[PDB]
Amino acid sequence: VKPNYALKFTLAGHTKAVSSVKFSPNGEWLASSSADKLIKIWGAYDGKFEKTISGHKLGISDVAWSSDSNLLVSASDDKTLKIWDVSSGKCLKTLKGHSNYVFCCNFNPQSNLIVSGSFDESVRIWDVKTGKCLKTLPAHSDPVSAVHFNRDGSLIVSSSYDGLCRIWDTASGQCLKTLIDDDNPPVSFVKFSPNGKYILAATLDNTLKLWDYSKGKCLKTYTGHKNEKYCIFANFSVTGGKWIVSGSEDNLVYIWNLQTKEIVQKLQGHTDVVISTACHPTENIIASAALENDKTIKLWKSDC
Template sequence: MAGHKSVLVIQSDWHDTLRNNDSTAWILRKPLGEKAEYGKIGGSAADDIFTVQSRTERTLSVTHKPSGLTTVFVSPVSTFNRIHSKSVICLDVADGGLGISVCTENKLAVWETETGEVRRSLEGHVFDVYTCRLFPSGIVVLSGGGDMQLRIWDAATGACPVVLKGHTAAVLDTAIVDRGKNIVSVSKDGTAKLWNCGQVKCIATLLSVECPINCCAITDVTGLVDLPAPMEEPDELEHCTSGKLLLVGCEDGKVFLVGVESRSVIGSFALGQNVLCVCWASPTVGVIGLSDGQLVAIDAMTPSKRPLSHDSSSPVESMAAYKGGVLVGRRDGLCQFYSLDGTSPFQLTGSDCDPVYKISSDSNNIYTACRDGLIRKYRGRDLNL
């Protein structure tokens, strides 16, 4: 595990505060489990503990001189405040120009990623919606929630032609297989299920455990990992499940690697903390976010686990794969990019200690969902990866 056991934290509105050459912004170094070290940058009141290395239109590079820790802070280019008025708990975007998000008011909204203008609201779930995502086409929405249902929507019309029922508790997360003829869902009922969307049918239960399954992510390891062959002929309703590997995270701290076509567990790990989110940073390397702030890497080729980073004790609320690494949103409002060597050179700013509940990106931009009810948009090129 590389990197420092500490993070730099800057005043959330530094981009506006430092417009005036005489103004200052506070900054601190927060070591894991120790007292924070405060300072100021900008203006005549700046101290010599923190040094500004460079600044562009939307970025600020700062070094903590005693430790050598350097972070590039990135400010949003847009802040959408008219999509939701309450905490935004999930979002997804696609290259087609649409975003989908849901808030604690149970408002499931389709909006334009360029302007933040709401196209329509999708109404039909009886209880809270916990997860939403766009199919690869960018014009079809998948959602799931407390009513134990999965719904598939036409983002253009708002119609909901498909409702999938079979879970016995709330649906917490989903994954889309290839182009989307099949999908996977995980639930508080402790199951991961494989569905056929066109025939509105549950094909199989891929995993069943005795605690809630909080999260899942799917990858294609064809030609990279030899997955077990299925014991029986695959169902005719299955499409593109060969070579697919599902990463599943549970409330009791266990993580499973499941071959989708074979329904077999090829690896399992006990991590000792609640697993809050998972993602695939590469086709064979998964990243696990834990309730104690740890990041753990899972290598599907071995399979094995290794610590990736533990520079913060704040729970990991959200993760998204990004350019060979992972974007991580925390409960204390930090949103960091981590390389797979454990270093964290970039931080997306704007949240003032409000949890970042979800992160998504398209080809050009990154979007975050926050408890303050705002969706923030960042330029991908500002991360300079």
């Protein structure tokens, strides 16, 4: 079993590097963030441009959807996060507290909390309703590259250029696990698997690893791509075959068989680093996006 991802749509409109793309949980929309300071919304199935959401004073590094698909949160170089009502375009809250670039963000499944990571080396947990910072975690000793909640929101995983992945108890703020791998290369991305049992981590030595995070055992290693500089997103694809998907600094999207670790497809089309990929929640659809020399977003579809 290999997939047959093929290019269907190219989405042009951002005027600087794209930073992040994410599908809405309801499957209807794709949200994109950029160094051009904008968020754009696009149809998930047809790539049709929907609207621009503006307000940040500097470039945006990440964007994330609430579980009901009504809200977005964005993370900016302006040291803030913003919560947006997507339909109205309204900025509902500006989350203030970080003392340097906010790099990454996510809602919990309940979507009453937001987690953020920053160049200030901290992770913050925020109340969606009030915009108040509830906890500041002294998480890392270098910039925080990614933050993600597990399936029931009881855990947060964080990654950092300090070379560590840490697991945090959402309720207490306590550090529960530090994952250590030899030579401590910068960790440029991390997230939980959809079931919550594993985490997938990227390091800046051209390597992705699937970890059992309780046992601290590395179960799989994925290689063949290029990643030595940029914080590139990676994914589990679960709508068809069970794949791992990532961008790459050679301008390709890589797809691996999760079990065997073989590369099953490489998607050609982008003309600069593929910084971000996302997998549609119900259909075999991948979105990908590229840095400044390209600036486009691509939608790819497979029969499996």
